[PDB]
Design a protein around this nucleic acid. Structure first.
Ligand code: ERY
Lengths: 122, 118, 209, 7, 55, 114
RNA sequence: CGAUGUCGGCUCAUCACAUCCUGGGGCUGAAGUAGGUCCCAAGGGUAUGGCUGUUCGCCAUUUAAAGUGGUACGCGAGCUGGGUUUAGAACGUCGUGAGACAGUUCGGUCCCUAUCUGCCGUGGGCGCUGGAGAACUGAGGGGGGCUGCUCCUAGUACGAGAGGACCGGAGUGGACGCAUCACUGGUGUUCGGGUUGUCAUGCCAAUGGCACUGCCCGGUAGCUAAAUGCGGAAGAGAUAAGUGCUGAAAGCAUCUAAGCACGAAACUUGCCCCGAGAUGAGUUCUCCCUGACCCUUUAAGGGUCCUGAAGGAACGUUGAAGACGACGACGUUGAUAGGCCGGGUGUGUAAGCGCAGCGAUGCGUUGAGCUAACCGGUACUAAUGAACCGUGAGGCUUAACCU
RNA sequence: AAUUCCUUGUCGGGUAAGUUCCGACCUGCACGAAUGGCGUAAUGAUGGCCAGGCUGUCUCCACCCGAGACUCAGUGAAAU
RNA sequence: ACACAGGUGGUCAGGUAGAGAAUACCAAGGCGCUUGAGAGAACUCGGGUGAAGGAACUAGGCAAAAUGGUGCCGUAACUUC
RNA sequence: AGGACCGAACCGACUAAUGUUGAAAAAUUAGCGGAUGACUUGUGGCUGGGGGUGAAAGGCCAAUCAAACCGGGAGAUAGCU
């Protein structure tokens, strides 16, 4: 249940290490975001050879939560630690080449299909 | 909002309520008939009657559970020696509630509660 | 058309073969029997009146006993009435099973919900609790300002305040029906219907197409 | 104690 | 919280009208004692439905 | 009551294997990718089982490549294909939430050999 | 001026239109897309943060939009008290000095048990013209009305390309309201276990008290949201602006003077809830009473004896009803509550005994033992026989009616 | 600047965004040398700001345990 | 002013764990605080726990949560050493 | 050794809550500061009203302090209600 001021860990190799969500997008007074949701983030820590530096502001997509998705059978998939994958702020394609850790199945639509094409497990 | 909640609070905290039901069960098994307030009598049914259900079969560990529940030795002696076989044949309903006027002092709904052999 | 009354007996869920686990509610729809048919002659409008269940003969009174012995129908607990929409009729005493609801696809439920009792405004009208600290004094969950000032000089009619919440008749519309069992006298609807288990759910075909 | 009082 | 001006004997009497204590309807006559008691309570001397339960 | 448990006795599946909490289990789930379906494996450790008849569930915990995942399963659902125990654990607590806490050598547990 | 408590924030708001979005139209220097300007329109909706005591503003980032105003610059017998505006202290400055400053800085008691109106709920009385029990009609009142994205239409009409629709169809989202725990969860001091200290049951073993439930670990039923279902309509009428058809007055022309037809989330219905105290007190069905006297102010009379029917009330067991009254179930031709039994559930292999080990401890008996509010049964206890209220056919006039 | 009106001076740092904080420059309304000037380790229930940890402060409240509130019996006020 | 949760100087001071006259539970010894009974609404007071997020609340982390003992290892700028 | 450190008694009174016709005309509860001293306290003295006392607030001087209380000038005076 990612809302504003939430710290997220990065999932890809874009060059970030630890970011902070600053706004959930889509609709007014929207409280929080689920796994298939785009959120705006700012970057708090980064590796120095990254494609993004500390203090940027750009979009991101959630990929993992501790609250977890809910499959239609009644199943729920609750990870450990929330995760995001950074997006090219206007073009919404990802930055990094690869992706660490598994993702969710419900994500699967064309831009996030480009996300899952790198992903190791589902 | 107590939808299908059972158990009466009786304006007492839970540890006092537990020790009070222990003392009342002791006096009821010893003297075989007492006079007490009506909701106290109803929850005394709800406490006492599993002890006389426990007392049907004489063993060691069941007497240790009786000593865990009521914490006295003469009470469990009188229980497992007398009220075990005296209530052998029946099933349920060992306590009997008659309501007997009101308390003169604070106007409390009073009731004689007894064991049905007497 | 004509609704059916039944007993809300718990909730469960069914499994489709594809994978969707649909949470359903089981209404024991006992077969209703009409006991009075209204018509335009005495009343100006047409309607039927049904009953179901069973009742002790000591528990009925002589008025309702005469009303049930008027036309061939045994005593049943409660009475209900349905409006018989213009092109449908019955002989008095003609029993209704749950096959007319086997024809239908979208259904709606009316029933008396659970009673939360005297509820405060946070439970009742979805208010907002005030700040629990920073100096707040004896005013955590109270509604606050209930009017303007001297220029109205009155609380308006229909102010949202605390009071009775629940034990009222309320409805759910356009529920999906999944399975209409014949021999067990059952109906299964998708999702939540009002009332605690043992309620009298009066079920109609849904008006919203 | 000023807060009520109108100065 | 303070009252504004004092009400009358009527507005006091109207509010005190609802405090009318009603009585019991009638006492039960016992079978064997003949004594009066309340319904579903024992008598003053101890009989209750013909059963001397406290003696 | 009785009618609800009759329907749920009808809908239940017959060969569920009983396992204690703490056994490493191999759970195979049907996965549907649109027009095609597949059988997909999930190996982990059960940490919590809830028996309610048809509402029976059990939550298997698997650390994948870096990260702990903890996924619940409805037992008599038609989606979960088969339940195969890999080894029989020997914990005594009924629920195992410190496996959600701990990592590594602390998160490893005993085998039963009862 | 024998007191109308100030700015700002929180909670709750309600109205106006000079309308920010959504809706309808005119013109456009409107090819399309997107705009500009003006007319109609108040049903609904209307940011989150950083700085500041701030309203305001600037910024960052959303949105369909970040409306303008009234309401004691709404709201302190609802909350706060940061600012201003008490007594302390200080800097600059002015003053010979006490002191002073729409200059600053640090610190600085927010009282009240609601009489009446109002509002939210819920009852007692009588009424409704013999009494009683149900089920409805509906005057009237109230609730709700927001909308994005994607896809089809289609890459079509349009245009040099670049870009790219009106109208209609479909799915999926947000914010809001209602309902319910079947799922995922929270709580679950009434269930089970682990454990430190200490005391007690004579002692070992086993338990119990107390230390915030001693600290923790799980957790049934309930309640609950972050969970799951649902709802904004479609249709219809009379329309606002607007566009019209025919048509004179006024040989022509013209939406209008006579007439006829379209036209908006507004109004009236359609959906939902209350609702015959709707004193205009409504309707339909069923049930229950078919005795005598006296008296005079012969009256819609007062009284006496006999009879008390339908049903209500009282009491008891009580309820996912409930502040209390109320409402719902049940009262032995009886499962209403308690208990018992079978089960379910939760906790995790009880105690005792044996065996191994010097010992803590372990293993077999053992998935044992204990299980709240759960389930299905079971008259074992507690719902007593009666007494209480309510009676005796229900006025007058006119009219039809059947004899 | 406890001093600065204009003023949220301009530049730099910190923040996604900083009228407060820190470092600067002097255009000191109206600093300035025992009505002391400028420094300063330690100290402070002292003032301003920042970060880590921790959380029901909050998004958004939910359940529970006790004490009053409510009903019954006894005594029985006050402001107005 | 009350049979008032306030104030009042000296002497003795036991057991177990403890550094201790703190604390936890006890002995001697003394009390259960001069109104009770039900019910288990809102609301307030005292507390407990909480999913995901962790100062987004706000005047301001106010209040809460958290840290807490003994020994050993190690410990920076700056300094009046 | 220390106007040294942590911390009970003791002395205080920084924060929040409850109190506001209280339990109390200044408190209680949970935290807080000092705790071998410029400390605290028991008993008995002394200083007094334009005076005392003051590590200085115009603070305290018997719940009264920019001049105590009590009696007396006094039935002050009041262009004011
Ligand atoms: C212990 C209880 C005391 O009251 C309080 O402490 C409350 C909390 C004060 O507010 C405090 C605190 C505060 C900030 O105001 C609440 C402050 O300004 C006033 C002076 O004192 C009150 C209410 C003041 O009223 C206010 O007085 C203002 C002059 C006018 C104002 N009115 C016009 C609106 C009025 O409400 C005032 C004078 O003390 C009231 C008079 C009756 C009293 O003197 C009485 C003897 C009180 O002392 C008291 C009852 O014992």
């Amino acid at each position: 249940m990612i809302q504003e001021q939430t710290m997220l860990n990065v999932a890809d190799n874009s060059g970030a290490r630890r970011v902070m969500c600053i706004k959930v997008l889509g609709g007014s007074h929207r409280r929080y975001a689920g796994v298939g949701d785009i959120i705006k983030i700012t970057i708090k820590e980064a590796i120095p050879r990254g494609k993004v530096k500390k203090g940027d502001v750009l979009k991101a997509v959630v990929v993992r939560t501790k609250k977890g998705v809910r499959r239609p059978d009644g199943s729920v998939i609750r990870f450990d630690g929330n995760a995001c994958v950074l997006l090219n702020n206007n073009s919404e394609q990802p930055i990094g080449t690869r992706i660490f850790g598994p993702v969710t199945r419900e994500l699967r639509s064309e831009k996030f299909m480009k996300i899952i094409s790198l992903a190791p497990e589902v | 909002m107590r939808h299908r909640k059972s158990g009466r609070q009786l304006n007492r905290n839970s540890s006092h309520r537990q020790a009070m039901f222990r003392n009342m069960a002791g006096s009821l098994v010893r003297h075989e008939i007492i006079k007490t307030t009506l909701p106290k009598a109803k929850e005394l049914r709800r406490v006492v009657e599993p002890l006389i259900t426990l007392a049907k079969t004489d063993s060691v560990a069941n007497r240790r559970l009786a000593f865990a529940r009521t914490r006295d030795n003469e009470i469990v002696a009188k229980l497992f020696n007398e009220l075990g076989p005296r209530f052998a044949s029946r099933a349920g309903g060992y306590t009997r509630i008659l309501k007997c006027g009101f308390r003169a002092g604070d106007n409390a709904p009073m009731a004689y509660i007894e064991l049905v052999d007497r | 058309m004509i609704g059916l009354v039944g007993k809300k007996v718990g909730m469960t869920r069914i499994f489709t073969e594809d994978g969707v686990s649909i949470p359903v509610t089981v209404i024991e729809v006992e077969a209703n029997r009409v006991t009075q048919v209204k018509d335009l002659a005495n009343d100006g409008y047409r309607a039927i009146q049904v009953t179901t269940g069973a009742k002790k003969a000591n528990r009925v009174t002589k008025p309702e006993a005469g009303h049930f012995a008027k036309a061939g129908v045994e005593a049943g607990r409660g009475l209900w009435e349905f409006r018989l929409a213009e092109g449908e009729e019955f002989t008095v005493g003609q029993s209704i099973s749950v096959e007319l609801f086997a024809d239908v696809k979208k259904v709606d439920v009316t029933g008396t919900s659970k009673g939360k009792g005297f509820a405060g405004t946070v439970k009742r009208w979805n208010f907002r609790t005030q700040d629990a600290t920073h100096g707040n004094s004896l005013s955590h969950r109270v509604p606050g300002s209930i009017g303007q000032n001297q220029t109205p000089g009155k609380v308006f009619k229909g102010k949202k305040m605390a009071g009775q919440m629940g034990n009222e008749r309320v409805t759910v519309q356009s529920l999906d029906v999944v399975r209409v069992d014949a021999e067990r006298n059952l109906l299964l609807v998708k999702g939540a219907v009002p009332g605690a288990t043992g309620s009298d759910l009066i079920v109609k075909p849904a008006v919203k197409a | 104690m000023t807060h009520s009082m109108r100065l | 919280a303070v009252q504004q001006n004092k009400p009358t004997r009527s507005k006091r009497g109207m509010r005190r009208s609802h405090d009318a204590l009603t009585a019991v309807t009638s006492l039960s006559v016992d079978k064997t004692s003949g004594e009066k008691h309340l319904r579903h309570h024992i008598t003053a001397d101890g009989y209750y439905r013909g059963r001397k339960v406290i003696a | 009551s009785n009618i609800i448990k009759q329907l749920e006795q009808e809908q239940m599946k017959q060969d569920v294997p009983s396992f204690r909490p703490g056994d490493t289990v191999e759970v195979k789930v049907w996965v549907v990718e649109g027009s095609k379906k597949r059988l997909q494996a999930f190996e982990g450790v059960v940490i919590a089982i809830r028996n309610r008849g048809l509402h029976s569930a059990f939550t298997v915990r698997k650390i994948s490549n870096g990260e702990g995942v903890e996924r619940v399963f409805q037992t008599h659902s038609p989606v979960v294909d088969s339940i195969s125990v890999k080894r029989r654990g020997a914990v005594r607590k009924a629920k195992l939430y410190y496996l959600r806490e701990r990592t590594g050598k602390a998160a490893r547990i005993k085998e039963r050999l009862n």
